[PDB]
Enzyme design. Sequence first.
Site, PDB file in Angstrom:
ATOM      1  N   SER A 176       0.846  -1.183   0.000  1.00  9.85           N
ATOM      2  CA  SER A 176       0.000   0.000   0.000  1.00  9.85           C
ATOM      3  C   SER A 176       0.882   1.233   0.000  1.00  9.85           C
ATOM      4  O   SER A 176       1.772   1.362   0.842  1.00  9.85           O
ATOM      5  CB  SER A 176      -0.934   0.028   1.208  1.00  9.85           C
ATOM      6  N   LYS A 180      -2.224   5.227  15.563  1.00  3.55           N
ATOM      7  CA  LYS A 180      -1.360   6.207  14.919  1.00  3.55           C
ATOM      8  C   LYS A 180      -1.646   7.613  15.422  1.00  3.55           C
ATOM      9  O   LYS A 180      -0.721   8.371  15.740  1.00  3.55           O
ATOM     10  CB  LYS A 180      -1.534   6.129  13.410  1.00  3.55           C
TER      11      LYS A 180
END
Lengths: 49, 98, 426, 182, 49
Positions: free
Chosen positions: D45, D88
Amino acid sequence: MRLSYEALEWRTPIENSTEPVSLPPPPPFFGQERAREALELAIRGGFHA
Amino acid sequence: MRLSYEALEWRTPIENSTEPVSLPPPPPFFGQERAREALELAIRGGFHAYLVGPPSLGKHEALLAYLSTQSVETPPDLLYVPLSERKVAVLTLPSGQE
Amino acid sequence: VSLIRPGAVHRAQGGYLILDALSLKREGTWEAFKRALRNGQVEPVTEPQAPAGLEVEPFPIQMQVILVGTPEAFEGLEEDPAFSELFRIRAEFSPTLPASPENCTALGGWLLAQGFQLTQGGLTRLYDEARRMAEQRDRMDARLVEIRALAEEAAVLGGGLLTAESVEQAIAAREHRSFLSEEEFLRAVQEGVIRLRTTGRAVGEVNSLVVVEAAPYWGRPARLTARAAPGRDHLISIDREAGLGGQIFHKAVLTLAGYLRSRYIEHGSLPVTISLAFEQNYVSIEGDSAGLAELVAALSAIGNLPLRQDLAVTGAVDQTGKVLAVGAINAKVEGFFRVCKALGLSGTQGVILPEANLANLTLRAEVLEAVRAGQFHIYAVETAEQALEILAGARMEGFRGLQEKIRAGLEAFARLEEGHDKEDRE
Amino acid sequence: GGQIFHKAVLTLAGYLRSRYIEHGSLPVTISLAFEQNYVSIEGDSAGLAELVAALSAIGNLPLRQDLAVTGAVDQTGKVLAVGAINAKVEGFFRVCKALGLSGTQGVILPEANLANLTLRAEVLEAVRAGQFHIYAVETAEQALEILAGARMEGFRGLQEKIRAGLEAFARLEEGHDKEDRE
Amino acid sequence: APAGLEVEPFPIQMQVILVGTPEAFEGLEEDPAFSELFRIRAEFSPTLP
């Protein structure tokens, strides 16, 4: 797009938090209606699930 | 081309789901005329056949149901008879005699 | 002598011995069985613990053996010339039956003999579901145990009587019990985790229809994008060349490249490089057949054509642009219909599928109801040009046609790269 | 990595190649690297951060460093959702709070991940206080607009500066081909 | 066993319900007998509404 706090707030608001809850036991496979219905069928029909 | 509903409708139309059906049982291997004729030949001729087909066709039960309606001449009685305490031979008698 | 145990050979004397080839070779028996059949006699199996045992006369084999199994089972057995010499009659079962009222009545009689209580509607629904299982409009599935299993479930859900409603409920439950992955996928689509355009137009991207490998019987749409850049004529399939895709040629890439190279010849080569990519890696790409969606996306990228996004595109294509039939057309159409119905039917969504698959189009009742209501459209195409005409909403030929727009885009890319040549000389 | 094509590299290359066509090819080679070894990189990705960093390197665009950038991207520049968005965002908030919240730090994350945003109480409190900002984007151009603090279109827009940088790199490579001339 | 007992096979009158992870069943669904025996599949959603 600057996300506002309201668009980010996800937590369930607590209206009062010092009150002991008294709740009836949930039916088995609560929230698992797919599996519960599959098992109801397997039991009513004697199939192996 | 924009397919119409009629060109797409494939379900055979119902007219009375309230009428119980009375239907005679179908011949074994219905819709399987190839296998049925192959087995008719293998039976009429005494050849060893072998049924081939994708699994779940019900080949095993259809085969047994088909053989059950067959009829061979009564097989002779086969048995083991000892010719001695060591030598045992095969004896074939008329059926029902063993 | 009185300790000899009778086996299948003895119990079959003057009759039939039905074996399973899978069991014959799973247990290494086939070799000794073949020696017996060829010899016509056999002695019972003895133990290696016997000092001298008995001198058993070989038992005459007077049966007819009838092996049973799948073609795969017999593949491992039909190599020796003895097999084809012993078993000369092959009784092969078609995995489908001619879908005829006679076969419907025969299925009804077979079920009655199995014990079920049917009604005309229930039998009709079971027959239609057999056709659905066969994935063919004019052939019902021959797997009678599978129809019997569905009939058992329908009898349970309907109280022993197989009415139309009971069979419909059995089928719906059979789907619902395996619908978890698609439930999560539809939730992702509705929440926005997976963004699919089912309205408006977009350039170089289309809704292909794939079958997921996590559930190789559920179809769902996949946003397939193509980006055109100036460069050599090579066509990159990002999802086929993500490692192990550089010097291993892919029949799909070769097919798309052959079509594009032969179709547009006004430059010594295709002056454009097209990158084709699925986002949403839940796609089990097939490097063995070029997708019609891939081709129309490439053509839109090249010609800058705003394809319709409400239409999904499925179907294989060959280097001549002919659209080939694909498997699981029902799964794919119903998957796109599920996605569109989740986001709300706009009234113009649809699927572009090969006309070759019209014999396989046995769609669920809801898809057919939407089609009849005009809320969902099925377009059958034979040529990739037809699919592009439907998507881009314009003809290929004539002025302001799609073909001249694609040629103009190719001319612009060629001009950019020959301007890089301009720089190469200057 | 010699013959192994990475879907991330192919995706970024496809975006850059198709997005900027005024030369027969992208006249620039972009080197992308994390300056650390605790990064477990996905070759499958393409990160939105990689794309915006490449675009900034090309156009010489000073990006805001107070905003962290997460999210995958496809060759059309659409920002796809990523896993562990909570981890994150909260990790960047931890790092920012450690160095002291400047009142402008934030995270640029995919709008596709709004259904997964269940930030801790402290991150939400900082967001409400205005000490931390969450930007949801759909296209990489939006992320670049937020980072570079300017719009793509229009005069002095980011896209014009990127095209100018690409023109300069094309002039330099054709300058080496000028050396190839004589 | 020298010759052991001549035990009659015990009838099976139960309903089997195999429980496990989808990974565990993958190694079991390659048999047309499995899907023939265990025809009811009760899947559990890893989340609830």
